[PDB]
Coordinates of C-alpha atoms and ligand atoms in Angstrom, one line a residue:
Chain R
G9 CA 226.9 65.2 131.6
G10 CA 229.8 67.5 130.6
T11 CA 233.5 67.0 130.9
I12 CA 235.0 65.8 134.2
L13 CA 238.8 66.1 134.6
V14 CA 240.6 65.1 137.7
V15 CA 243.9 67.0 138.0
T16 CA 246.5 64.9 139.8
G17 CA 250.2 65.2 140.2
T18 CA 253.3 63.0 140.5
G19 CA 253.8 64.4 144.0
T20 CA 253.1 67.2 146.4
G21 CA 254.2 70.7 145.5
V22 CA 254.2 70.2 141.7
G23 CA 251.8 73.0 141.1
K24 CA 248.5 71.1 140.7
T25 CA 246.5 74.0 142.0
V26 CA 248.2 76.5 139.7
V27 CA 247.5 74.2 136.8
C28 CA 243.8 73.9 137.8
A29 CA 243.7 77.7 137.8
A30 CA 245.5 78.0 134.4
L31 CA 243.3 75.4 132.6
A32 CA 240.3 77.1 134.2
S33 CA 241.3 80.5 132.9
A34 CA 242.0 79.1 129.4
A35 CA 238.7 77.3 129.2
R36 CA 236.8 80.4 130.4
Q37 CA 238.6 82.4 127.8
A38 CA 237.3 79.8 125.4
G39 CA 233.8 80.6 126.8
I40 CA 233.6 77.3 128.6
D41 CA 231.9 77.2 132.0
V42 CA 234.2 75.9 134.7
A43 CA 233.7 74.4 138.1
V44 CA 236.6 73.3 140.4
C45 CA 236.1 70.8 143.3
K46 CA 238.7 70.4 146.1
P47 CA 237.0 67.9 148.4
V48 CA 239.6 67.9 151.2
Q49 CA 241.9 70.8 152.0
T50 CA 244.6 70.6 154.7
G51 CA 247.0 73.3 156.1
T52 CA 244.2 75.7 156.8
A53 CA 245.9 77.1 160.0
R54 CA 248.6 78.6 157.8
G55 CA 246.0 79.7 155.2
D56 CA 246.3 76.9 152.6
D57 CA 243.2 77.4 150.4
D58 CA 243.6 76.2 146.9
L59 CA 240.0 77.0 145.8
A60 CA 240.7 80.6 146.8
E61 CA 243.7 80.6 144.5
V62 CA 241.6 79.3 141.6
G63 CA 239.1 82.0 142.4
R64 CA 241.7 84.8 142.5
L65 CA 243.8 83.6 139.5
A66 CA 241.0 82.3 137.1
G67 CA 237.8 83.9 138.2
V68 CA 236.0 80.5 138.7
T69 CA 233.1 81.0 141.0
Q70 CA 231.8 77.4 141.3
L71 CA 234.3 76.3 143.9
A72 CA 233.2 73.3 145.9
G73 CA 234.7 71.7 149.0
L74 CA 233.7 69.4 151.8
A75 CA 236.3 69.4 154.6
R76 CA 239.1 71.6 155.9
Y77 CA 241.8 70.4 158.3
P78 CA 244.0 72.9 160.1
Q79 CA 247.1 70.7 160.0
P80 CA 249.5 70.8 157.0
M81 CA 249.6 67.0 156.9
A82 CA 248.3 64.4 154.5
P83 CA 244.4 64.3 154.7
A84 CA 244.2 61.1 156.7
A85 CA 246.9 62.3 159.2
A86 CA 245.2 65.7 159.5
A87 CA 241.9 64.0 160.1
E88 CA 243.5 61.7 162.8
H89 CA 245.2 64.7 164.4
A90 CA 242.0 66.8 164.4
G91 CA 240.0 63.9 165.7
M92 CA 237.5 63.6 162.9
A93 CA 236.9 61.2 160.0
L94 CA 237.5 62.1 156.4
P95 CA 234.4 62.6 154.3
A96 CA 232.8 59.5 152.8
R97 CA 233.4 58.3 149.3
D98 CA 229.8 58.9 148.3
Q99 CA 230.0 62.6 149.4
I100 CA 232.9 63.3 147.1
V101 CA 231.5 61.4 144.1
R102 CA 228.0 63.0 144.3
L103 CA 229.3 66.5 145.0
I104 CA 231.3 66.1 141.8
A105 CA 228.4 64.5 139.8
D106 CA 226.1 67.2 141.0
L107 CA 228.6 69.8 139.8
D108 CA 228.9 68.1 136.4
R109 CA 226.5 69.4 133.7
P110 CA 226.5 69.9 129.9
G111 CA 228.8 72.7 128.7
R112 CA 230.9 72.6 131.9
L113 CA 234.5 71.5 132.4
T114 CA 234.6 70.3 136.0
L115 CA 238.1 70.1 137.5
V116 CA 238.6 67.9 140.5
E117 CA 241.7 68.6 142.6
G118 CA 242.9 65.9 145.0
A119 CA 245.5 66.3 147.7
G120 CA 249.1 65.4 147.0
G121 CA 249.6 62.4 144.7
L122 CA 247.3 59.9 143.1
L123 CA 247.2 57.3 145.8
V124 CA 246.8 59.5 148.8
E125 CA 243.8 58.8 151.0
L126 CA 240.9 61.1 150.4
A127 CA 237.9 59.5 152.2
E128 CA 237.0 56.8 154.6
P129 CA 237.9 53.8 154.1
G130 CA 241.1 54.4 152.2
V131 CA 239.6 55.7 149.0
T132 CA 241.8 57.8 146.7
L133 CA 241.4 60.4 143.9
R134 CA 241.9 57.4 141.6
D135 CA 238.8 55.6 143.0
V136 CA 236.8 58.9 142.8
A137 CA 237.9 59.3 139.1
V138 CA 236.7 55.8 138.4
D139 CA 233.4 56.4 140.0
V140 CA 232.7 59.5 137.8
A141 CA 234.3 58.4 134.5
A142 CA 236.7 61.3 134.6
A143 CA 239.9 61.5 132.6
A144 CA 243.1 62.4 134.4
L145 CA 245.4 65.4 133.8
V146 CA 248.8 64.7 135.3
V147 CA 250.9 67.6 136.6
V148 CA 254.6 66.9 136.6
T149 CA 257.9 68.5 137.4
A150 CA 260.8 69.1 135.0
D151 CA 263.4 67.8 137.6
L152 CA 265.5 64.7 137.8
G153 CA 263.2 61.9 138.8
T154 CA 260.1 63.2 137.0
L155 CA 260.3 60.4 134.4
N156 CA 260.0 57.6 137.0
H157 CA 257.3 59.4 138.9
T158 CA 255.3 60.1 135.7
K159 CA 255.4 56.5 134.5
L160 CA 254.4 55.3 137.9
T161 CA 251.4 57.5 138.0
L162 CA 250.4 56.8 134.4
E163 CA 250.7 53.0 135.2
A164 CA 248.4 53.4 138.2
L165 CA 245.9 55.4 136.1
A166 CA 245.8 52.6 133.5
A167 CA 245.5 49.8 136.0
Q168 CA 242.0 51.2 136.7
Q169 CA 241.3 52.3 133.1
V170 CA 241.3 56.0 134.0
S171 CA 242.2 57.7 130.7
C172 CA 245.1 60.1 130.6
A173 CA 244.2 63.5 129.3
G174 CA 247.8 64.5 129.3
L175 CA 250.6 66.0 131.4
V176 CA 251.3 69.6 132.3
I177 CA 254.7 70.7 133.6
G178 CA 253.6 72.7 136.7
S179 CA 256.6 75.0 136.8
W180 CA 259.0 75.6 133.9
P181 CA 262.3 77.2 135.3
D182 CA 264.2 80.2 133.9
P183 CA 266.7 79.6 132.6
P184 CA 265.8 75.9 132.1
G185 CA 269.1 74.0 132.4
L186 CA 270.2 70.7 130.8
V187 CA 268.1 68.3 133.0
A188 CA 264.9 70.2 132.6
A189 CA 265.2 70.5 128.8
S190 CA 266.0 66.8 128.4
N191 CA 263.2 65.8 130.7
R192 CA 260.7 67.9 128.8
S193 CA 261.5 66.0 125.6
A194 CA 261.3 62.7 127.3
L195 CA 258.0 63.5 129.0
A196 CA 256.7 64.3 125.5
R197 CA 257.9 60.8 124.6
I198 CA 255.5 59.2 127.1
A199 CA 252.5 61.5 127.0
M200 CA 251.1 64.7 125.4
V201 CA 252.7 67.6 127.2
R202 CA 249.7 70.0 127.3
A203 CA 251.5 73.0 128.8
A204 CA 254.5 74.1 130.8
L205 CA 253.7 76.9 133.2
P206 CA 256.4 79.5 133.7
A207 CA 257.9 79.4 137.2
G208 CA 256.3 82.1 139.4
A209 CA 253.0 82.4 137.5
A210 CA 251.2 81.9 140.8
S211 CA 252.1 85.4 142.0
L212 CA 250.7 87.0 138.8
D213 CA 247.7 89.2 139.0
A214 CA 244.6 88.0 137.3
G215 CA 245.1 89.8 134.0
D216 CA 248.7 88.7 133.5
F217 CA 247.7 85.2 134.7
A218 CA 245.0 85.1 132.1
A219 CA 247.4 86.0 129.3
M220 CA 249.9 83.4 130.4
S221 CA 247.2 80.8 130.7
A222 CA 245.8 81.7 127.3
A223 CA 249.2 81.2 125.7
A224 CA 250.1 78.1 127.7
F225 CA 247.6 75.6 126.3
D226 CA 246.7 74.7 122.8
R227 CA 243.5 76.5 122.0
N228 CA 242.0 73.7 120.0
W229 CA 242.6 71.2 122.8
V230 CA 241.0 73.5 125.3
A231 CA 238.0 74.1 123.0
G232 CA 237.9 70.3 122.3
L233 CA 237.5 69.5 126.0
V234 CA 233.8 70.1 126.1
Chain Z
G9 CA 271.7 29.8 143.1
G10 CA 271.9 32.2 146.0
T11 CA 269.8 35.3 147.0
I12 CA 269.3 38.3 144.8
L13 CA 267.7 41.6 146.0
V14 CA 267.3 44.6 143.7
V15 CA 267.4 47.5 146.1
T16 CA 265.2 50.2 144.5
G17 CA 263.6 53.4 145.8
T18 CA 260.6 55.8 145.5
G19 CA 262.9 58.2 143.7
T20 CA 266.4 59.5 143.3
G21 CA 268.3 60.6 146.4
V22 CA 266.4 58.6 149.0
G23 CA 269.4 56.6 150.4
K24 CA 269.5 53.5 148.2
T25 CA 273.3 53.3 148.2
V26 CA 273.6 53.8 151.9
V27 CA 270.9 51.1 152.4
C28 CA 272.9 48.7 150.1
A29 CA 275.9 49.3 152.3
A30 CA 273.9 48.9 155.6
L31 CA 272.2 45.7 154.6
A32 CA 275.5 44.4 153.2
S33 CA 277.3 45.2 156.5
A34 CA 274.6 43.5 158.6
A35 CA 274.7 40.5 156.3
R36 CA 278.5 40.3 156.3
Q37 CA 278.5 40.4 160.1
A38 CA 276.0 37.5 159.9
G39 CA 278.6 35.6 158.0
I40 CA 276.8 35.9 154.7
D41 CA 278.9 36.5 151.6
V42 CA 277.8 39.7 149.9
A43 CA 278.2 41.1 146.3
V44 CA 276.9 44.5 145.3
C45 CA 276.1 45.3 141.7
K46 CA 275.6 48.7 140.0
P47 CA 274.9 48.1 136.3
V48 CA 274.2 51.7 135.3
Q49 CA 276.1 54.5 137.1
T50 CA 275.7 58.2 136.0
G51 CA 277.4 61.4 137.2
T52 CA 281.0 60.0 137.1
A53 CA 282.3 63.4 135.9
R54 CA 281.1 64.6 139.3
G55 CA 282.8 61.8 141.2
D56 CA 279.7 59.8 141.8
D57 CA 280.6 56.1 142.4
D58 CA 278.0 54.2 144.3
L59 CA 280.0 50.9 144.3
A60 CA 283.0 52.6 145.8
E61 CA 280.8 54.2 148.5
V62 CA 279.4 50.7 149.4
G63 CA 282.9 49.5 149.6
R64 CA 284.0 52.4 151.7
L65 CA 281.2 52.1 154.3
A66 CA 280.8 48.4 154.3
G67 CA 284.0 46.8 153.2
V68 CA 282.3 45.0 150.4
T69 CA 285.0 43.9 148.0
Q70 CA 282.8 42.1 145.3
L71 CA 281.7 45.2 143.4
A72 CA 280.5 44.9 139.8
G73 CA 279.6 47.8 137.5
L74 CA 279.0 47.9 133.7
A75 CA 277.9 51.2 132.2
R76 CA 279.3 54.5 133.4
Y77 CA 278.2 57.9 132.2
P78 CA 279.8 61.3 133.1
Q79 CA 276.8 63.6 133.4
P80 CA 274.4 63.5 136.5
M81 CA 271.3 62.8 134.5
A82 CA 268.9 60.0 133.7
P83 CA 270.9 57.1 132.2
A84 CA 269.2 57.6 128.8
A85 CA 270.1 61.3 128.9
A86 CA 273.6 60.7 130.2
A87 CA 274.2 58.2 127.4
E88 CA 272.8 60.5 124.8
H89 CA 275.0 63.3 126.0
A90 CA 278.2 61.2 126.0
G91 CA 277.5 60.0 122.4
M92 CA 277.1 56.4 123.9
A93 CA 274.5 53.8 124.1
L94 CA 272.7 52.1 127.0
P95 CA 273.6 48.5 127.8
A96 CA 271.4 45.6 126.6
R97 CA 269.0 43.9 128.9
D98 CA 271.1 40.7 128.6
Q99 CA 274.3 42.6 129.5
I100 CA 272.7 43.7 132.7
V101 CA 271.3 40.3 133.6
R102 CA 274.6 38.6 132.6
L103 CA 276.5 40.9 134.9
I104 CA 274.1 39.9 137.7
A105 CA 274.0 36.1 137.0
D106 CA 277.8 35.8 137.1
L107 CA 277.7 37.1 140.7
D108 CA 274.9 34.8 141.9
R109 CA 276.3 32.0 144.1
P110 CA 274.7 29.8 146.8
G111 CA 275.0 31.4 150.2
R112 CA 275.7 34.8 148.6
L113 CA 273.5 37.8 149.0
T114 CA 273.7 39.8 145.7
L115 CA 272.3 43.4 146.0
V116 CA 271.5 45.1 142.8
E117 CA 271.3 48.9 143.1
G118 CA 269.5 50.8 140.3
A119 CA 269.7 54.2 138.7
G120 CA 267.1 56.4 140.4
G121 CA 263.6 55.1 140.9
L122 CA 262.1 51.8 139.8
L123 CA 260.9 52.8 136.4
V124 CA 264.1 54.6 135.2
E125 CA 265.3 53.2 131.9
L126 CA 268.3 51.0 132.1
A127 CA 268.4 49.4 128.7
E128 CA 266.8 49.9 125.3
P129 CA 263.9 50.1 124.9
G130 CA 262.5 51.3 128.2
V131 CA 263.9 48.3 130.1
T132 CA 263.8 49.0 133.8
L133 CA 265.0 47.4 137.0
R134 CA 261.6 45.9 137.5
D135 CA 262.1 43.9 134.2
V136 CA 265.6 43.0 135.4
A137 CA 264.1 41.7 138.7
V138 CA 261.7 39.5 136.8
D139 CA 264.6 38.2 134.6
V140 CA 266.8 37.3 137.6
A141 CA 263.8 36.3 139.8
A142 CA 264.9 38.8 142.4
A143 CA 262.9 40.4 145.2
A144 CA 262.8 44.2 145.5
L145 CA 263.7 46.1 148.6
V146 CA 262.2 49.6 148.5
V147 CA 264.0 52.5 150.1
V148 CA 261.6 55.3 151.1
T149 CA 261.6 58.7 152.7
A150 CA 259.7 59.7 155.8
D151 CA 258.7 63.0 154.2
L152 CA 255.4 64.2 153.0
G153 CA 254.5 62.3 149.8
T154 CA 256.2 59.1 150.7
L155 CA 253.0 57.2 151.1
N156 CA 251.8 57.9 147.5
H157 CA 255.3 57.2 146.0
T158 CA 255.6 54.0 148.1
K159 CA 252.2 52.7 147.1
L160 CA 252.9 53.6 143.5
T161 CA 256.2 51.6 143.7
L162 CA 254.7 48.6 145.4
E163 CA 251.8 48.6 142.9
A164 CA 254.2 48.7 140.0
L165 CA 256.1 45.7 141.7
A166 CA 253.0 43.6 141.9
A167 CA 252.1 44.5 138.3
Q168 CA 254.8 42.1 137.1
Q169 CA 254.7 39.7 140.0
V170 CA 257.9 41.0 141.7
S171 CA 258.0 40.3 145.3
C172 CA 258.5 43.1 147.8
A173 CA 261.1 42.2 150.4
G174 CA 260.0 45.1 152.6
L175 CA 260.7 48.8 153.0
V176 CA 263.7 50.6 154.4
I177 CA 263.4 54.2 155.4
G178 CA 266.6 55.6 154.0
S179 CA 267.0 58.5 156.4
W180 CA 265.3 58.6 159.7
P181 CA 265.5 62.0 161.5
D182 CA 266.2 62.2 165.2
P183 CA 263.9 63.5 166.5
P184 CA 260.9 62.6 164.3
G185 CA 258.4 65.3 163.6
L186 CA 254.6 64.7 163.4
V187 CA 254.7 64.0 159.7
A188 CA 257.7 61.6 160.0
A189 CA 256.0 59.7 162.8
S190 CA 252.7 59.4 161.0
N191 CA 254.3 58.3 157.8
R192 CA 256.3 55.7 159.6
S193 CA 253.3 54.2 161.2
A194 CA 251.4 54.2 157.9
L195 CA 254.3 52.6 156.1
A196 CA 254.3 49.8 158.6
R197 CA 250.7 49.1 157.6
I198 CA 251.5 49.1 153.9
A199 CA 254.5 46.8 154.1
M200 CA 257.1 45.3 156.5
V201 CA 259.4 48.1 157.6
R202 CA 262.8 46.3 157.7
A203 CA 264.9 49.3 158.9
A204 CA 265.0 53.1 159.3
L205 CA 268.6 54.2 158.9
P206 CA 269.5 57.1 161.1
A207 CA 270.1 60.3 159.3
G208 CA 273.7 61.2 158.5
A209 CA 274.7 57.5 158.5
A210 CA 277.2 58.2 155.6
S211 CA 279.3 60.1 158.2
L212 CA 279.9 57.0 160.4
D213 CA 283.3 55.3 160.1
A214 CA 283.7 51.6 159.5
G215 CA 282.9 50.6 163.1
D216 CA 280.2 53.1 163.7
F217 CA 278.5 52.2 160.4
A218 CA 278.8 48.5 161.2
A219 CA 277.2 48.9 164.7
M220 CA 274.4 51.0 163.3
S221 CA 274.1 48.5 160.5
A222 CA 273.7 45.5 162.8
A223 CA 271.1 47.3 165.0
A224 CA 269.2 48.7 162.0
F225 CA 268.0 45.3 160.7
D226 CA 266.5 42.4 162.5
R227 CA 269.3 39.8 162.7
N228 CA 266.8 37.0 162.0
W229 CA 265.5 38.7 158.8
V230 CA 269.0 39.2 157.4
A231 CA 270.1 35.7 158.3
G232 CA 266.9 34.3 156.7
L233 CA 267.7 36.1 153.5
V234 CA 270.2 33.3 152.6
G235 CA 270.1 29.6 153.1
Ligands
CTP301 N1 254.3 78.0 137.4 C1 254.2 78.0 138.9 C2 253.6 76.8 139.6 C3 253.6 76.8 141.1 N2 254.0 77.9 141.9 C4 254.0 77.9 143.2 O1 254.4 76.4 143.5 C5 254.0 76.1 144.7 C6 253.3 74.7 144.8 O2 252.5 74.7 143.6 P1 250.9 74.4 143.9 O3 250.1 75.2 142.8 O4 250.6 74.8 145.3 O5 250.5 72.9 143.6 P2 250.2 71.6 144.6 O6 250.8 70.4 143.8 O7 248.7 71.5 144.6 O8 250.7 71.6 146.1 P3 250.1 70.5 147.2 O9 249.3 69.4 146.5 O10 251.2 69.8 147.9 O11 249.2 71.3 148.2 C7 252.9 77.3 145.1 O12 253.6 78.2 146.0 C8 252.6 77.9 144.0 O13 252.3 79.3 144.4 C9 254.5 79.1 141.2 O14 254.9 80.1 141.8 N3 254.6 79.1 139.7
CTP302 N1 270.7 56.9 156.5 C1 271.3 57.8 155.5 C2 270.7 57.9 154.2 C3 271.3 58.9 153.2 N2 272.5 59.6 153.5 C4 273.0 60.5 152.6 O1 271.9 61.1 151.7 C5 272.3 61.0 150.4 C6 271.4 59.9 149.8 O2 271.9 58.7 150.0 P1 272.0 57.8 148.6 O3 272.1 56.3 149.0 O4 273.1 58.3 147.7 O5 270.5 58.0 147.9 P2 270.3 57.2 146.5 O6 268.8 56.9 146.2 O7 271.1 55.9 146.5 O8 271.0 58.3 145.4 P3 270.9 58.0 143.8 O9 269.5 58.2 143.4 O10 271.8 59.1 143.2 O11 271.4 56.6 143.6 C7 273.8 60.6 150.4 O12 274.6 61.8 150.3 C8 274.1 59.9 151.6 O13 275.4 60.3 152.1 C9 273.1 59.4 154.8 O14 274.1 60.0 155.1 N3 272.5 58.5 155.8
MG303 MG1 247.4 71.7 145.9
MG304 MG1 272.8 56.1 145.1

């Protein structure tokens, strides 16, 4: 095996996908081989496609998915609306374990938060992470409430002995403001803040994104991942 | 003693205060004596006063605060910015215990979500609930993400053996979209949904808010809250 990291977030819209892409670009610039798996994608009618974003921004080519639901709903709702089950637990876990190899950082992106349902019957990104011995990278906001949400997620992580690889602030505002600055310090009082990605990085081109990403993570940590 | 509920939520801004007021109103109209307690209150320099708002909507007269910070921040941060300290765990529990009385329903509204720090070091409303043996009423949204946040909150409640008294959807839109409807029906499978307060309820005057309040909750559940 190699390094499997699940990339979760305190909620929906915290920039999990942009963090996957950023870590991917950093690791690739460290000469690490990266794969990204997004088992279930919703919102496809309006063009939601987070693996494509990772491809565009980071140049990852090993981009693995199992199901696509048109509706911009939570996976289980989208499944119900479309009239089709979610994938099974086994499909996700073996797709990920077949992606994993020596030398590779394999990022696994869930949908929404940690406890959202990802497969039949009621299995979550947390379960998947258990099944594959992955650590968890927690993407957070810098807004009022982030502390509560972070501690809640880290507590759920620990309840199943999924190790915490750290937090990333998905979007660092400009200019910051009092709340975001104080929250950044507190977040660092509960876990290793690995990076804070400038607000708007998503819209960068691949070159500028690569420069941002390179400077956003500690190089030794990135290298030390695999 | 009497009955104590901490009234918590999946985050900040979900309708905790309005639920305190609504449940207090329904319980008052059931003849139950009601106290509402707000041990940590931030954002006073912006005119935030949750106790006053409960009194304004519900007529609750037994309102107890303790710590008040000017800035609209996390209590830890608002205290650090005022040059002040957080209360002690026993200060908060004392404030609550002095309110407790047979036949009285004592609602304890927190600062933000369940794991926000109320006292040094890292003391939360969950700890306070264990200390005063209270049950937790969890206010939720109907919006995307509410299932994850709700499950996280319930799981954190069971982590310390704190009973869940049920959920209350703080703001229920009329009409409900596809996501709201789905989230509601899933929430009913995760826990007892005690009420779904209609959106904009803070705009109802005393009588409108009391009517809405009595209809919002099952009369039998409210009455069963207090012997
Ligand atoms: N530093 C950042 C981080 C995020 N985004 C934007 O923030 C929004 C949501 O972030 P996303 O990367 O989509 O993360 P997710 O948490 O995966 O969203 P969800 O799980 O709900 O699909 C996107 O428009 C993304 O383009 C941005 O512009 N600059
Ligand atoms: N059924 C509802 C629910 C909420 N609100 C409004 O939406 C906001 C949130 O209500 P509040 O109880 O203040 O949410 P809390 O979680 O209590 O806010 P805080 O985190 O600051 O304590 C308020 O402006 C309130 O007037 C409303 O009008 N009717
Ligand atoms: Mg995403
Ligand atoms: Mg409030």
